[PDB]
Write a protein that binds this ligand. Structure first.
Ligand SMILES: Cc1c(-c2nc3nc(N)nc(OCC4CCCCC4)c3[nH]2)cccc1S(N)(=O)=O
Lengths: 298, 257
């Protein structure tokens, strides 16, 4: 019926939510990404994740945020129609593993990602799942935030939100420490990790567990204390038995980076969320003085 | 104030687009303002029983008023609309929304589980999935940061007044959440501390006592008359220590505007 104009081309993956296909509109020729979402029609109804993703994507209209084109209702399925993007940042990093992503392209991508994130934050939306698998690129040099399944509309000031958020490797220390409140800072942390990853060609903090993740951050950035992070020792999961590692010099953390890049990166990875740089202020950082839009080689 | 100004400006734009039709109840052949008051009052109780956020209650009421702005509903189905709206608000806003079965239970088996789930879907279609509506609560919360000093009685009293506005479509439908918040805040501030709508909030909102006065006059009357209102669940809820017993406070007799 309502999907009669779509020809499935191929499956491009899944999620807990359901299946993602590449399809074409038989009448117009437009190629799309279709997300199929099962409705729990005898049990739970429409899932909370889809409700949030749809309502939030309908508000967010920006060049660096994936376009929701349509929402097709059946009695048993919901189809999200999205613009089709060539690939994700994860697969692009794998394709680039031997050469590395050139620094102009890294700069360009980070710039765009910050523009998309500033737009979210200005519209009271937290993404809460930034990771390379969720960032989609096209063949012209654009990159876009995607999978708003874990996103949420926040209040000013925030209240306590869902604790189980952000994939482990990209998860902010305040979350790991079990802090009562978290805010847009957690998305910036994620982005910082992704920036370092683009640069060194490996995850910055590939923890195997919650405590391991935390210790990987401490071993790199130094164990935080009251002087760098007022209030740290008062957090629900802070432990006085934490080993106290000294901070390592950033030119070892990200060898290829200039002074400016290092300056940006350290501000994105600052411990205290209230001092961690905002996306908007990061847009003004000297690192971005000379940004261009190169075309990737796909 | 990280993104505070952009967000405030954006919600000011959205409260206009997510606003219900002011006339709507006159266009409903079978339901009235008095039936809607009963429903909202029942929703208050459900929020208490399941310990839902106040934000969830305010969202649910917005979804119901928008739905009824476009769909004719028979009175026997009005509670079904409200059950589905509250379920959707919970799914949107709560960390741990109650399960569908709890929403079936709370309607005294008037409706079936299939009815609730089908209604959920219809509500979503009618609202076209536009669930992130600004509420009186979202503005109050920001207005609270301009307190000199912070005062927990003022906050709860403000929330109580804002909540009372939910009950009476006439006259509160006429006013934007930002304005109802301004009135509630000022009225709370004055009752508790004899003080006035902050200068810093005139700057932020662009509203003055002069512009808030119409809403204020209505709100003050609502407040003085609250003990006699057929709907009492909001007064009861606001008796508890959680809310510093604010519904027990004496309303001021005059405003001296
Ligand atoms: C990503 C991708 C795609 C691909 N193009 C896509 N275009 C859009 N608009 N959305 C997608 O899903 C985003 C959603 C899916 C679930 C996880 C992330 C959020 C896409 N996936 C099409 C061929 C190949 C590839 S890949 N893996 O790079 O070879």
């Amino acid at each position: 019926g309502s999907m009669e104009n779509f020809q499935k081309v191929e499956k491009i993956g899944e999620g807990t939510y359901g299946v993602v296909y590449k399809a074409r509109n038989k009448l117009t020729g437009e190629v799309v990404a279709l997300k199929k979402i099962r409705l729990d029609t005898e049990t739970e109804g429409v899932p909370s994740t889809a409700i949030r993703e749809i309502s939030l994507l309908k508000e967010l209209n920006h060049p660096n945020i994936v376009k929701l084109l349509d929402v097709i209702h059946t009695e048993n399925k919901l189809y999200l129609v999205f613009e089709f993007l060539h690939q994700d940042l994860k697969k692009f990093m794998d394709a680039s593993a031997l050469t590395g992503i050139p620094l102009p392209l890294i700069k360009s991508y980070l710039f765009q990602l910050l523009q998309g994130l500033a737009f979210c934050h200005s519209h009271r939306v937290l993404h809460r799942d930034l990771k390379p698998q969720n960032l989609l690129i096209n063949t012209e040099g654009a990159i876009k935030l995607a999978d708003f399944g874990l996103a949420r509309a926040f209040g000013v000031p925030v209240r306590t939100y869902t604790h189980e958020v952000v994939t482990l490797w990209y998860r902010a220390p305040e979350i790991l420490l079990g802090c009562k409140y978290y805010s847009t800072a957690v998305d910036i942390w994620s982005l910082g990790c992704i920036f370092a990853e683009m640069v060194t060609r490996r995850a910055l903090f590939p923890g195997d567990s919650e405590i391991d993740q935390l210790f990987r951050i401490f071993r790199t950035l130094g164990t935080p204390d009251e002087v760098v992070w007022p209030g740290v020792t008062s957090m629900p999961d802070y432990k006085p038995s934490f080993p106290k590692w000294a901070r390592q010099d950033f030119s070892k953390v990200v060898p290829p980076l200039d002074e400016d890049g290092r300056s940006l990166l350290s501000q994105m990875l600052h411990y205290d969320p209230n001092k961690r740089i905002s996306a908007k202020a990061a847009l003004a950082h000297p690192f971005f003085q000379d940004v261009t839009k190169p075309v990737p080689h796909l | 104030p990280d993104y505070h100004e952009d967000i405030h400006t954006y919600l000011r734009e959205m409260e206009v687009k997510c606003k219900p039709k002011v006339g709507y109840m006159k266009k409903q052949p079978d339901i009235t303002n008095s039936m809607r008051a009963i429903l909202v009052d029942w929703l208050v109780e459900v929020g208490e029983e399941y310990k839902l956020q106040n934000e969830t209650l305010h969202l649910a009421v917005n979804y119901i008023d928008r739905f009824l702005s476009s769909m004719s509903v028979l009175r026997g189905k009005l509670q079904l609309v409200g059950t589905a709206a509250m379920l959707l608000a919970s799914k949107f806003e709560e960390i741990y929304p109650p399960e569908v079965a709890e929403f079936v239970y709370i309607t005294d088996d008037t409706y079936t589980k299939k009815q609730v789930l089908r209604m959920e879907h219809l509500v979503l279609k009618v609202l076209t999935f536009d669930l992130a509506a600004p509420t009186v609560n979202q503005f109050l919360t920001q207005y609270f940061l301009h307190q000199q000093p912070a005062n927990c009685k003022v906050e709860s009293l403000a929330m109580f007044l804002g909540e009372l506005s939910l009950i009476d479509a006439d006259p509160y439908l006429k006013y934007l959440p930002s304005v109802i918040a301004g009135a509630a805040f000022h009225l709370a501030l004055y009752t508790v501390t004899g003080q006035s709508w902050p200068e810093s909030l005139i700057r932020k909102t662009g509203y003055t006592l002069e512009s808030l006065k119409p809403c204020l006059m209505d709100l003050h009357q609502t407040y003085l008359k609250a003990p006699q209102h057929a709907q009492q669940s909001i007064r009861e809820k606001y008796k508890n220590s959680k809310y510093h017993g604010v519904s027990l406070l004496n309303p001021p007799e005059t405003l001296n505007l």
